[PDB]
Design an enzyme around this catalytic site. Structure first.
Site, PDB file in Angstrom:
ATOM      1  N   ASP A 416      19.797 -15.257 -11.188  1.00 17.04           N
ATOM      2  CA  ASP A 416      19.445 -14.143 -10.319  1.00 17.04           C
ATOM      3  C   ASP A 416      20.356 -14.171  -9.100  1.00 17.04           C
ATOM      4  O   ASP A 416      20.462 -15.200  -8.426  1.00 17.04           O
ATOM      5  CB  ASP A 416      17.978 -14.223  -9.893  1.00 17.04           C
ATOM      6  CG  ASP A 416      17.455 -12.911  -9.338  1.00 17.04           C
ATOM      7  OD1 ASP A 416      17.692 -11.862  -9.970  1.00 17.04           O
ATOM      8  OD2 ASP A 416      16.797 -12.928  -8.275  1.00 17.04           O
ATOM      9  N   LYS A 417      21.020 -13.048  -8.826  1.00 16.88           N
ATOM     10  CA  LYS A 417      22.023 -13.028  -7.767  1.00 16.88           C
ATOM     11  C   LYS A 417      21.396 -13.266  -6.402  1.00 16.88           C
ATOM     12  O   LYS A 417      21.849 -14.126  -5.639  1.00 16.88           O
ATOM     13  CB  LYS A 417      22.776 -11.702  -7.772  1.00 16.88           C
ATOM     14  CG  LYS A 417      23.885 -11.644  -6.743  1.00 16.88           C
ATOM     15  CD  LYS A 417      24.608 -10.317  -6.788  1.00 16.88           C
ATOM     16  CE  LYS A 417      23.759  -9.233  -6.162  1.00 16.88           C
ATOM     17  NZ  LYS A 417      24.491  -7.949  -6.043  1.00 16.88           N
ATOM     18  N   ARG A 567      28.239  -4.338   2.258  1.00 15.95           N
ATOM     19  CA  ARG A 567      27.586  -3.214   2.913  1.00 15.95           C
ATOM     20  C   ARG A 567      28.462  -2.684   4.038  1.00 15.95           C
ATOM     21  O   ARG A 567      28.652  -3.358   5.055  1.00 15.95           O
ATOM     22  CB  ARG A 567      26.214  -3.629   3.447  1.00 15.95           C
ATOM     23  CG  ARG A 567      25.483  -2.537   4.209  1.00 15.95           C
ATOM     24  CD  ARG A 567      23.970  -2.695   4.115  1.00 15.95           C
ATOM     25  NE  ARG A 567      23.487  -3.894   4.792  1.00 15.95           N
ATOM     26  CZ  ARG A 567      23.219  -5.045   4.189  1.00 15.95           C
ATOM     27  NH1 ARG A 567      23.372  -5.194   2.884  1.00 15.95           N
ATOM     28  NH2 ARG A 567      22.786  -6.071   4.915  1.00 15.95           N
ATOM     29  N   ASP A 632      20.176  -5.760  -7.776  1.00 15.03           N
ATOM     30  CA  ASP A 632      20.921  -5.168  -6.677  1.00 15.03           C
ATOM     31  C   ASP A 632      21.819  -4.045  -7.187  1.00 15.03           C
ATOM     32  O   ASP A 632      21.782  -3.660  -8.359  1.00 15.03           O
ATOM     33  CB  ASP A 632      21.744  -6.233  -5.959  1.00 15.03           C
ATOM     34  CG  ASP A 632      20.957  -6.952  -4.883  1.00 15.03           C
ATOM     35  OD1 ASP A 632      20.175  -6.286  -4.177  1.00 15.03           O
ATOM     36  OD2 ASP A 632      21.116  -8.183  -4.743  1.00 15.03           O
ATOM     37  N   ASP A 747      14.033 -16.998  -8.165  1.00 15.41           N
ATOM     38  CA  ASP A 747      12.997 -17.311  -7.188  1.00 15.41           C
ATOM     39  C   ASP A 747      12.077 -16.150  -6.853  1.00 15.41           C
ATOM     40  O   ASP A 747      10.910 -16.381  -6.537  1.00 15.41           O
ATOM     41  CB  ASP A 747      13.621 -17.824  -5.886  1.00 15.41           C
ATOM     42  CG  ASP A 747      14.495 -16.792  -5.205  1.00 15.41           C
ATOM     43  OD1 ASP A 747      14.667 -15.682  -5.750  1.00 15.41           O
ATOM     44  OD2 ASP A 747      14.991 -17.087  -4.099  1.00 15.41           O
ATOM     45  N   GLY A 748      12.569 -14.917  -6.886  1.00 16.57           N
ATOM     46  CA  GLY A 748      11.723 -13.786  -6.575  1.00 16.57           C
ATOM     47  C   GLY A 748      10.708 -13.514  -7.667  1.00 16.57           C
ATOM     48  O   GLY A 748      10.807 -14.008  -8.790  1.00 16.57           O
ATOM     49  N   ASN A 750      10.449 -10.897  -9.222  1.00 11.89           N
ATOM     50  CA  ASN A 750      11.096 -10.164 -10.303  1.00 11.89           C
ATOM     51  C   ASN A 750      11.312 -11.058 -11.511  1.00 11.89           C
ATOM     52  O   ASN A 750      11.100 -10.638 -12.654  1.00 11.89           O
ATOM     53  CB  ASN A 750      12.434  -9.594  -9.837  1.00 11.89           C
ATOM     54  CG  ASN A 750      12.284  -8.574  -8.740  1.00 11.89           C
ATOM     55  OD1 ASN A 750      12.723  -8.787  -7.610  1.00 11.89           O
ATOM     56  ND2 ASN A 750      11.683  -7.439  -9.073  1.00 11.89           N
TER      57      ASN A 750
END
Length: 1016
Positions: A416-417, A567, A632, A747-748, A750
């Site tokens: 997971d990024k 960003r 993302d 970790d999330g 998701n």
């Protein structure tokens, strides 16, 4: 089992078909998830005279809509309510309907009760190995060995209880990792009371905000008033924080829909609130004491999105059995040879009519028990426990100890990024657009105008302690500026000789406007006059038009920065001339955007952790495949994958769903240079040419269109972007069904859905403790934020898998040798005395305990471990060693027999007491040589596990065994072999026995090594 469950229900009560009054309702599981169970309907008195039939399955309540649908339906939510209702809502006013709604909607309770120890023990008793052990114990009970059987059964049950206790202390860690419910400031009875999270019920009005304890949002809530900054990276995966708007501004004629208006108006549960913006005091409405954002509770309990995923895992699938098909077929093979030897014993015994039948049957059955050792599960459990203890030293836990061997067979690793590879903390690389070309200049060399533009325009605030809190983008924005932000809204330079700026009015981000404006004034140098300057920052594409002067390369630099994925956000600054004090209030906050002047860009990206690259490279050098599954933006995911060398191709192409129906999907490159529609053939050529990545929207479109192409495409995709929590699980299941063992590190919340189904799932903790939700449903949990845990687990799993292969080989060979030796020689009347047999048993147990405690090497290797015991190499080497050892045993027996005095009895007396002889001594020497040679030979050493000399207990065990064999062969002490009850053998015969022993050892080693070289 499930088919057996309903039999008990049928026995207890008869089935009912008439819907008038049903005592129980059978639950259909559906083939996807769930289990068959029985639930009792609940009868409730109807205030309006209408009764409702309801039941609870998997903490989900359903209802039977007799009015319209005449079928069982889930409980309706305020999801479908009109958007105008909440505008005039005043919240719950009386406790009677509070209790009523608590009853008919449920409660916001997410707390586990750990499964009962009695239930855990009963489930553990369902293992066929325990049943077989009990059968064997009762069988020796029948064999008149009652005390020994009782002791063995007691030891087995004690060790099983120890295993259950270890699992329970692991479960305690998960219970501690559960979110402890926290106090919340809630409105009730026209007043604000502090209320715990568990007892919150839908329909109340709650004033949420940034808490000092960094706790998560309790339940899905609808933002009635106020603005707040939310970071749903844990739940949605989007690293970029998103805005939330109140509903009081919107028109009432609209109808609220969760699918359409999720991103801007409903605050989800489990996410973290960053900043809270209290509403203006002029507006009249809900007044909170904490001055937090007052909001309406939409959903509670397990019905929230986080609750949906969590529960759907919690009662979703079973714990995969520690008794795989591999061990079952191994036992079947061992039992086939056991039955062959047993039939030989039975036939030759029945050839003697004088001997009794029941006694011979008991002897044969004792043989059948001896061939399959009672330590067959015990030794594997010991090896797994040793591996777990070794792994626990790396600050890492394992809640499912049996999946450690599965770590060796992993072929594809998923990451997971956000939260695992990319750290939460973000640092600014520089301020772009202030120098010629696309090169970004450091913050040191940017002009003072850029300094004030960066410093003045910020939404950060100061607490009583003065700690800076807010958007991490703005956090690093101010940190690079380094100017102190005072509580009096004065920004003062630490190292610059410039006058500070005081902000008068701040206008926060508007999702409609895509811009955020800050109005402030500075004192002119040498004068007391106040000059008002406003710096506005926001979306660059929208802010472009407001620039009065714009460089020609604006769009080009913007595009190039966007390709990097960082960003990008434009910085603006307008002279505005001189303004009076009253005109500052008169000028609206949205009026400053006109006639702006360009100042430059700011580039901000998430920096990878230092050791991530090394771990990824080390994993890639182990003949492994690494895939990124994150939610993302696809461009950012591709850039991060490129930086970590996930993809080495020159270009990577995006796959997108078609806007027009009936149009074939076509790949587009990140640079846009190469476009090519998908071909019906294999994607092998495209994958060879360039890297492949799939978005969540494209995944959904392909799933709706054709599963087959998606299943072919998935194994060759390196980057997965905009992937939903259910889509993660679908991808992982698709990889698993192909046969590949899957490993994931996320970790999330998701990643929870896919981690539960992953063969070896590892959960991390970002910014390392709150001990988040993903560790609850992950078999493995690490307290270190780094991904070195993946490499450590892979090394440990390789060592454990190699150890298990060696254990299976040694157990099989020793069992075959012992079974044949007993079956033929007890029939032949050649048996050892109890002392030497006890020595054999204790030495074998010690040497197994020593091999089970192997240590792993520091560095992994390119060679791959054997996937399983079911390969040609294992069977062939076990059989060939069996024959080469059998020939030597037969030769030694014949050599001893040809010289022994000729037998006086045609038959054999099976219960005649032991008498020392040449033949029995020769057999014992050969058996000890057998054990020595096997434990010396079947140790598959480097590069997979520590070398043989390093395992000091094992070295000492083999050395003492060899010394005992040599001493028995020499017979230096007559008292020694007298105690062992072995008559001395002439040295002339010692020569031949030693020669054949050495020949057997050398032949075994040579054949095993030759086969390993040929079929490596």
């Amino acid at each position: 089992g499930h088919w057996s469950v309903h039999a008990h229900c049928a026995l207890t009560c008869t089935p009912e078909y008439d819907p008038s009054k049903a005592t129980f309702v059978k639950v259909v599981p559906t083939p996807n998830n769930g289990s068959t169970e029985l639930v009792a309907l609940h009868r409730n008195e109807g205030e309006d005279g209408l009764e409702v039939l309801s039941f609870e399955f998997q903490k989900i309540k359903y209802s039977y809509d007799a009015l319209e649908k005449k079928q069982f339906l889930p409980v309706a939510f305020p999801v479908g309510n009109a958007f105008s209702y909440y505008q005039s809502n005043r919240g719950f006013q009386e406790d009677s309907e509070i209790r009523a709604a608590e009853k008919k909607f449920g409660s916001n309770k997410a707390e586990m009760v750990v499964p009962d120890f009695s239930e855990l023990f009963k489930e553990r008793a369902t293992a066929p190995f325990f049943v077989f052990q009990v059968f064997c114990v009762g069988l020796w009970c029948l064999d008149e060995y009652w005390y020994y059987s009782v002791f063995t059964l007691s030891m087995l049950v004690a060790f099983e209880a120890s295993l259950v206790q270890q699992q329970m202390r692991n479960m305690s860690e998960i219970r501690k990792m559960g979110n402890k419910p926290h106090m919340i400031q809630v409105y009730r009875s026209r007043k604000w009371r502090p209320i715990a999270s568990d007892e919150i019920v839908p329909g109340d009005i709650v004033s949420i905000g940034r808490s000092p304890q960094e706790n998560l949002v309790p339940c899905d809530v609808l933002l009635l008033r106020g603005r707040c900054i939310v970071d749903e990276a844990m739940l949605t995966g989007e690293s970029v924080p998103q805005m939330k708007e109140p509903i009081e501004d919107l028109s009432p004629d609209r109808v609220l829909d969760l699918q359409a208006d999720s991103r801007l108006h409903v605050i989800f549960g489990g996410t973290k609130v960053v900043q809270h913006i209290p509403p203006q005091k002029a507006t009249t409405g809900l007044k909170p004491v904490d001055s937090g954002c007052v909001a309406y509770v939409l959903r509670t309990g397990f019905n929230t999105s986080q609750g949906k995923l969590l529960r759907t895992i919690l009662f979703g699938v079973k714990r995969v059995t520690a008794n795989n098909l591999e061990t079952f077929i191994f036992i079947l093979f061992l039992l086939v040879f056991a039955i062959a030897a047993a039939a030989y014993v039975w036939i030759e015994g029945t050839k003697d009519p004088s001997r009794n039948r029941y006694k011979l049957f008991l002897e044969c059955t004792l043989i059948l028990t001896s061939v399959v050792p009672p330590e067959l599960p015990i030794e594997l459990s010991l090896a797994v426990n040793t591996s777990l203890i070794a792994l626990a030293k790396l600050y890492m836990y394992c809640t499912e100890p049996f999946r450690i061997p599965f770590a060796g067979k992993v072929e594809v690793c998923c990451f997971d990024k956000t939260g695992t590879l990319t750290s939460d903390s973000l640092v600014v690389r520089g301020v772009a657009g202030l120098r010629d070309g696309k090169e970004v200049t450091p913050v040191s060399s940017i002009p003072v105008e850029t300094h004030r533009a960066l410093a003045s325009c910020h939404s950060l605030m100061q607490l009583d302690d003065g700690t800076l809190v807010g958007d991490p983008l703005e956090k690093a924005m101010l940190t690079a500026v380094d100017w102190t932000l005072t509580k009096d809204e004065k920004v003062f330079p630490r190292s610059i000789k410039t006058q500070g700026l005081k902000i008068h009015q701040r206008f926060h981000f508007a999702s409609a406007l895509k811009r955020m404006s800050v109005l402030a004034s500075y004192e002119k140098l040498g004068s007391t006059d106040l000059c008002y300057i406003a710096a506005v920052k926001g979306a660059p594409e929208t802010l472009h038009s407001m620039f009065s002067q714009c460089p020609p390369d604006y769009h080009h630099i913007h595009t190039e920065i966007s390709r990097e994925g960082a960003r990008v956000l434009a910085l603006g600054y307008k002279e505005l001339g001189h303004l009076t004090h009253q005109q500052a209030r008169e000028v609206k906050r949205e009026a400053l955007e006109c006639s702006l002047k360009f100042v430059g860009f700011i580039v901000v990206s998430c920096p990878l952790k230092a050791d991530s690259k090394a771990v990824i490279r080390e994993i890639q050098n182990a003949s492994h495949r690494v895939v990124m599954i994150t939610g993302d933006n696809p461009l950012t995911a591709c850039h991060v994958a490129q930086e970590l060398h996930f993809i080495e191709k020159a270009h990577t192409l995006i796959l997108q769903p078609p806007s027009e129906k009936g149009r074939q999907c076509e790949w587009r490159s990140i640079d846009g240079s190469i476009v090519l529609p998908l071909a019906r053939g294999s994607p092998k050529a495209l994958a060879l040419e360039y890297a492949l990545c799939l978005t969540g929207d494209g995944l959904a479109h392909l799933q709706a269109t054709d599963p087959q192409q998606l299943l072919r495409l998935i194994p060759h995709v390196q980057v997965f972007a905009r992937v939903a929590p259910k889509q993660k699980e679908f991808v992982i299941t698709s990889l698993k069904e192909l046969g590949y063992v899957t490993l994931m590190c996320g970790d999330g919340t998701n990643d929870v859905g896919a981690l539960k189904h992953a063969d070896v799932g590892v959960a991390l903790l970002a910014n390392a403790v709150k001990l988040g939700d993903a560790s609850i449903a992950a078999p493995f949990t690490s307290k270190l934020s780094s991904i070195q845990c993946i490499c450590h687990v892979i090394k440990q799993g390789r060592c454990t898998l190699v150890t298990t292969l060696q254990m299976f080989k040694i157990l099989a060979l020793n069992a075959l040798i012992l079974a044949y030796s007993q079956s033929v020689l007890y029939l032949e009347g050649v048996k050892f005395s109890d002392f030497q047999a006890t020595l054999q048993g204790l030495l074998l147990a010690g040497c197994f305990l020593f091999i089970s405690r192997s240590k792993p090497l520091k560095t992994l290797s390119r060679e791959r471990p054997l996937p399983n015991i079911f390969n040609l190499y294992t069977i062939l080497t076990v059989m060939l060693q069996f024959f080469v050892h059998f020939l030597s045993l037969v030769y030694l027996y014949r050599e001893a027999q040809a010289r022994s005095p000729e037998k006086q009895e045609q038959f054999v007396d099976l219960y005649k007491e032991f008498e020392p002889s040449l033949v029995n001594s020769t057999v014992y020497i050969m058996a000890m040589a057998m054990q020595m040679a096997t434990f010396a030979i079947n140790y598959k050493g480097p590069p997979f596990m520590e070398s043989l000399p390093e395992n000091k207990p094992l070295v000492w065990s083999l050395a003492v065994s060899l010394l005992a064999i040599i001493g028995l062969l020499l017979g230096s002490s007559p008292d020694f072999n007298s105690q062992f009850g072995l008559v001395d053998i002439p040295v002339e015969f010692k020569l031949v026995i030693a020669q054949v022993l050495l020949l057997d050892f050398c032949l075994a080693l040579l054949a095993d090594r030759v086969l390993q070289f040929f079929l490596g």
